[PDB]
């Protein structure tokens, strides 16, 4: 069975998830008791400021403690939600594309490459005139491979980038204290919004266009019913339309993401 | 075997030699056949004038012998044609051998940057 | 076998690295000790004249002299660790990030071109119908070549950039004793960060992609079990996906380096 | 016996001479050639082999076309950038004194700033492509002069190495001009 | 005979006139330019046709010559197309700007339209410098390429590989310079104002 995007996604997702999430766990889980101990020591320090001297607005110290507790809770719960959220996003990609993505792409490419292989059989039968059929097969194969590969590559880039951003999540959440750190956090949010809009847009348009292309490839056969020139032209024209649209979408997605603010 | 350029020159020369030998043997055999026809005309013109029944029987048998010789000639010509086809096939097979050797996956060398 | 990426890498790390690096380092090794003795004389004599002239040595003079001496010693040790760390980085950075550094790339290309050579052999066997396999081999060869070449070209450009940036390093580091020359130092620091990010990203990602491609295509065999059109389409898809990811990386690296500031 | 660039540069020098002739009436390398020769010869031996069979040998024709295309694209990219920068710098020098005349007015110092920026950019571009193109094309020429189609060297290995080197050099030649422009903008 | 750029430019010019210039007239009411490039492309296609004829002659090895013909054909076609296309775009830009010049210029009565008039003049200057740049550079490169292709022959004197490589290198170099040209034109136009 033509299962190629399935094992590639499996291997790359296994590497990314296991490696990065294991790193984040080994860090955060060991850190957590240290963070709690540090918070207790900070409480003792404000105890010194209460009892000895040099204090300022104790009710305000309530605001500072509230902010710090919020940051710590966000960081720890965000580490847990990250450990769950890698799987959450991985599942969200196929469901968003369907409303699996890899199976759909593989089936459409399977139809395209079945047509290419039948053209190759036709070429191999003649053995003298069987080079025009060979070129036909090459054209179909290149078109289908181009479409499937560009789409899968952009999806994989989005998934890896989102996983890396989630992995770095706790650092930038702990880095929301000061004003420059808030400047960091704003750019982090900009990037994650950019990549999320990218992955959703590609899921939708990729699903629609590749279902159209799979249907068209299924409707083609190399026999006396159809004029082969028209069918090959339709295949290449549809492939080029799809590839240019998928190529020009991410610029628009990034532009709108930046324009939101 | 040897250098591939040696293979190329040997194949080219062998093809040219094969074609030329075919043509030349054809011509030589043709004037041979002309000699044979002159001999046949002589035999008949001399057989018109026998005198005793034994003489005519003997020269009839000699004519039968010349007929047998011509049949042997026909066998030889068919046989040369078969040899020509066989050696054309051999030359094509040597071309195939060189072509397989140049492209063969058993090669391992690679030009190296120096 | 296929020995091109490691010898090309070695030759590049020899010729241009030797010329620029050793010319700059030979000049610096020639000219520092004299300058250092001169600096000691200048500062000790400054402090002698302040002792025996107009008052110009409060704790401030000690402060200014201390920081300037720190910068000068940093740049000199920067030349020494320039020779040492240029050697160490060129040797280790790709290898340590993701045996040997380019040996994985060479092995993967070796598998790819062995399969292409098998296709060429089958093409030459028939010699009349054996042109379909010729196009198969050409397509496979172009795919593997484009992937390996993109990866190697980005790696080579990144290492050359690091070598040149480190070679200019001492001058730029010495070039922050004033304010505007500090403004010029900032862009050199930004570029160093940019190309460090570049080497890290391509090292990891391209190592992963080459390992995946090598396993996939070494698995590939030309017989009566695997549909040849399916396998060739898969190889083309993998090549194009990897090319897309590697083309999208450098913009990511440069943008992140600019964002850090 | 491969002379391509030399007539091109000589004609461009003729055009530059016409430009300086205009301005006067007012005021009244081979390394790539040699490397591409070796590349094209190693491509043409493939055509020879393909022609010898004349029925079986089309793979050799495709190999020759691939080699020819790789070498042609590489040499063409390098020479195109070299020639572009050469003609642009010559034209800017020809218009130089008119731009330097902008000393008369304080506001026209922006003209000189832009002029100097462009001149420094194209000078850096000359330096960068000169050095890098020379090194890469020498490497490619050595590799292709080492290439052969005989019973020892593998066709796939040789051609794959050729195409890999060609694409690598094209990628580098594409990245250099942006770096040159960025450096020129930053320094100025 | 090779009439490709001449009829194309003639049709574009007449459909520009009738549909823009006469409308501008209504609003008011209230040696050849392409001969050299046509000859150069004619010579290139002549060489391609010679290659195709040789390819047809052999009928057994007649695929290598077909491929050479295709390479020559693609190179000359791409270069001539790039040049003529940029010329067409520039011509249509100047024609539209001249059609709409009256209104945009008369808009400068009120001071708030100074920015609009500046943008209009910026477009006009950009596309004028653009037409000048293609005129000069592309005329030179068409002359060079036409000379090379016309002096090309398929004979025992000239090696096929060298000639094909020469045509490819010239075509690619010319395309690279003509791709770099519009950026330079836009930069100079922006720096002008």
How far is residue E102's CA from residue E108's CA, in Å, rounded to a whole number? 10
Is residue D106 classed as helix, strand or coil in its secondary structure? coil
E183 touches D: beta carbon within 8 Å: no
Q: Looking at beta carbons, which residues of chain C come within 8 Å of B108?
A: 1
Count Cβ atoms below 10 Å from residue C244 Cβ, excluding itself. 19
Q: Looking at beta carbons, which residues of chain E come within 8 Å of D72?
A: 165, 168-169, 172
Q: Looking at beta carbons, which residues of chain C come within 8 Å of D157?
A: 2, 113, 117
- Kindly state the tokens that stand for C221: 């065999």
Closest by Cα among A210, A201, A214, A204 to A250: A201
- Name E79's Cβ contacts closer than 8 Å, sequence gap at least 6: E141, E145, E171, E174, E175
The reply to whether residue B103 touches residue C121, judged by beta carbons under 8 angstroms, is yes
Q: Looking at beta carbons, which residues of chain C come within 8 Å of B96?
A: 127
- Kindly state the tokens that stand for B74: 């026909």
How far is residue A77's CA from residue D146's CA, in Å, rounded to a whole number? 62
How far is residue A120's CA from residue A117's CA, in Å, rounded to a whole number? 5
- Measured between CB atoms, which of B99, B112, B113 is closest to C124? B99
How far is residue A189's CA from residue A187's CA, in Å, rounded to a whole number? 5
Alpha helices in chain E (DSSP H): 5-16, 22-29, 35-58, 64-106, 114-150, 160-192
Do residues A152 and A199 make contact, with C-beta atoms less than 8 angstroms apart? no
Please count the CA atoms within 13 angstroms of the CA of A212 that sit on its side-chain side. 13
User: Which of C114, C141, C194 should one mutate to test binding to chain D, selecting the residue with the greatest count of D CBs within 10 A?
Assistant: C141
D174 touches E: beta carbon within 8 Å: no
Burial class (CB in 10 A: 0-12, 13-18, 19+), D76: buried
How far is residue A76's CA from residue A32's CA, in Å, rounded to a whole number? 7
Do residues A90 and A13 make contact, with C-beta atoms less than 8 angstroms apart? yes
The DSSP output letter for E112 is G
**CA triple A8-A13-A14, angle to 5 deg:** 100
Closest by Cα among A237, A254, A246 to A196: A254
SS3 string of A7-35?
HHHHHHHHHHHHHHHHHHHHHHHHHHHHH
User: Which of D154, D158, D168 should one mutate to test binding to chain B, selecting the residue with the greatest count of B CBs within 10 A?
Assistant: D154
Alpha helices in chain D (DSSP H): 5-26, 30-53, 59-100, 109-146, 155-187
C229 touches A: beta carbon within 8 Å: yes
How far is residue B112's CA from residue B73's CA, in Å, rounded to a whole number? 62
How far is residue E126's CA from residue E120's CA, in Å, rounded to a whole number? 10
* Separation in Å, CA A121 to CA A40, A131, A220: 75, 11, 15
Q: Looking at beta carbons, which residues of chain C come within 8 Å of A123?
A: 132
- Name D111's Cβ contacts closer than 8 Å, sequence gap at least 6: D99, D102
The reply to whether residue D153 touches residue B107, judged by beta carbons under 8 angstroms, is yes
The DSSP output letter for D153 is B
Do residues B11 and B93 make contact, with C-beta atoms less than 8 angstroms apart? no
The reply to whether residue D80 touches residue E173, judged by beta carbons under 8 angstroms, is yes
- Name E90's Cβ contacts closer than 8 Å, sequence gap at least 6: E127, E130, E131, E134
Count Cβ atoms below 10 Å from residue B79 Cβ, excluding itself. 10
How far is residue D163's CA from residue D158's CA, in Å, rounded to a whole number? 9
The reply to whether residue D79 touches residue E162, judged by beta carbons under 8 angstroms, is no
The reply to whether residue B111 touches residue D161, judged by beta carbons under 8 angstroms, is yes
Do residues A15 and C208 make contact, with C-beta atoms less than 8 angstroms apart? yes
Closest by Cα among A210, A236, A223, A17 to A138: A236
Interface of B with C (CB under 8 A): 96, 99-100, 102-105, 107-108, 110, 112-113
Q: How many helices (H) and strands (E) does chain A have?
A: 7, 0
Identify residues after which chain E is interrupted (C–N over 2.5 A): 30
Do residues E54 and E154 make contact, with C-beta atoms less than 8 angstroms apart? yes
D85 touches E: beta carbon within 8 Å: no
- Kindly state the tokens that stand for E89: 């775009």
Is residue B109 classed as helix, strand or coil in its secondary structure? strand
Q: What is the CA radius of gyration of chain C?
A: 27
Identify residues after which chain D is interrupted (C–N over 2.5 A): 28
- Measured between CB atoms, which of B99, B100, B110 is closest to C2? B110
The reply to whether residue B107 touches residue D143, judged by beta carbons under 8 angstroms, is no
How far is residue C152's CA from residue C157's CA, in Å, rounded to a whole number? 8
Closest by Cα among E176, E150, E148, E175 to E162: E148
- Kindly state the tokens that stand for A128: 């003298």
Counting CB pairs under 8 A, whether chains B and A reach 3 or more, is no
The reply to whether residue D155 touches residue C120, judged by beta carbons under 8 angstroms, is yes
Give per-residue burial for D141-180: e unless 16+ CB within 10 Å, then b: bbbbbbbebebebbbbbbbbbbbbbbbbbbbbbebbbeeb
Alpha helices in B1-114 (DSSP H): 4-47, 53-103
- Kindly state the tokens that stand for A93: 């990609």
E164 touches D: beta carbon within 8 Å: yes
Do residues C11 and B113 make contact, with C-beta atoms less than 8 angstroms apart? yes
Q: Tell me, in Å, the resolution of the deposited structure.
A: 3.7
Q: For residue D153, list its beta bridge partners.
A: B109
How far is residue C140's CA from residue A145's CA, in Å, rounded to a whole number? 13
CA dihedral (A190, A192, A195, A201) positive or negative: negative
Closest by Cα among D117, D123, D132 to D169: D132
Do residues D138 and C8 make contact, with C-beta atoms less than 8 angstroms apart? no
Total residue count of chain D as it appears in this document: 188
Q: How far is C250 from chain D (nearest CA, A)?
A: 11
**Looking at chain A, which subunits does it touch, using at least 3 CB pairs closer than 8 Å as the criterion?**
C
Closest by Cα among D115, A4, A140 to C239: A4
SS3 string of chain C?
CCCCHHHHHHHHHHHHHHHHHHHHHHHHHHHHHHHHHHHHHHHHHHHHHHHCCCCCCCHHHHHHHHHHHHHHHHHHHHHHHHHHHHHHHHHHHHHHHCCCCCHHHHHHHHHHHHHHHHHHHHHHHHCCCCCHHHHHHHHHHHHHHHHHHHHHHHHHHHHHHHHHHHHHHHHHHHCCCCHHHHHHHHHHHHHHHHHHHHHHHHHHHHHHHHHHHHHHHHHCCCCCCCCHHHHHHHHHHHHHHHHHHHHHHHHHHHHHHHHHC
Burial class (CB in 10 A: 0-12, 13-18, 19+), A227: exposed
D41 touches E: beta carbon within 8 Å: yes
How far is residue D70's CA from residue A132's CA, in Å, rounded to a whole number? 25
Give the residue on D whose Cα is nearest the Cα of B101: D151
Q: For residue B109, list its beta bridge partners.
A: D153
* Separation in Å, CA E163 to CA C101, D66, E45, E50, E157: 41, 15, 15, 14, 11
Phi-psi region of C226 (alpha: psi -120 to 50; beta: other; left: phi over 0): beta
Q: How far is E191 from chain D (nearest CA, A)?
A: 8
Do residues C227 and A117 make contact, with C-beta atoms less than 8 angstroms apart? yes
- Kindly state the tokens that stand for E23: 């409308």
- Measured between CB atoms, which of E140, E168, E176 is closest to D69? E168
């Amino acid at each position: 069975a033509f299962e190629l995007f399935t094992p590639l996604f499996n291997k790359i997702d296994q590497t990314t998830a296991t490696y990065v999430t294991d790193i984040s766990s080994r860090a955060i889980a060991a850190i957590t008791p240290v963070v709690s101990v540090g918070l207790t020591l900070g409480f003792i320090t404000y105890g010194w400021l209460i009892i000895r001297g040099a204090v300022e607005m104790p009710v305000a110290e309530f605001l500072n403690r509230c902010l710090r507790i919020g940051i710590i809770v966000s960081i720890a719960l965000a580490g847990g939600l990250y450990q769950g959220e890698i799987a959450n996003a991985i599942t969200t990609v196929p469901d968003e594309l369907a409303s699996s993505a890899a199976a759909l792409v593989d089936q459409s490419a399977q139809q395209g490459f079945d047509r290419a292989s039948e053209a190759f059989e036709e070429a191999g039968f003649f053995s003298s005139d069987g080079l025009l059929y060979g070129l036909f097969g090459i054209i179909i194969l290149l078109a289908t491979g181009l479409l499937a590969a560009i789409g899968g590559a952009f999806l994989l880039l989005a998934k890896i980038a989102l996983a890396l951003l989630a992995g770095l999540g706790p650092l930038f959440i702990l880095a929301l204290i000061w004003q420059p750190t808030h400047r960091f956090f704003d750019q982090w949010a900009q990037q994650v919004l950019n990549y999320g809009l990218l992955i959703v847009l590609f899921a939708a348009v990729f699903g629609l266009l590749m279902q159209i292309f799979g249907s068209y490839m299924a409707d083609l056969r190399f026999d006396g019913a159809q004029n082969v020139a028209y069918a090959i032209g339709g295949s290449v024209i549809l492939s080029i339309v799809s590839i240019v649209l998928l190529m020009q979408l991410p610029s628009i997605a990034s532009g709108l993401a930046g324009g939101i603010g | 075997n040897g250098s591939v350029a040696d293979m190329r020159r040997s194949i080219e020369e062998r093809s040219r030699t094969a074609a030329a030998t075919d043509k030349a043997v054809g011509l030589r055999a043709y004037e041979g056949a002309q000699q044979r026809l002159a001999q046949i005309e002589g035999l008949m013109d001399e057989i018109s004038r026998t005198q005793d029944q034994k003489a005519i029987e003997e020269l009839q048998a000699r004519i039968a012998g010349e007929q047998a010789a011509i049949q042997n000639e026909t066998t030889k010509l068919q046989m040369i044609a078969q040899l020509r086809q066989a050696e054309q096939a051999l030359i094509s097979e040597q071309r195939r051998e060189r072509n397989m050797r140049i492209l063969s996956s058993g090669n391992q060398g690679m030009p190296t940057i120096q």
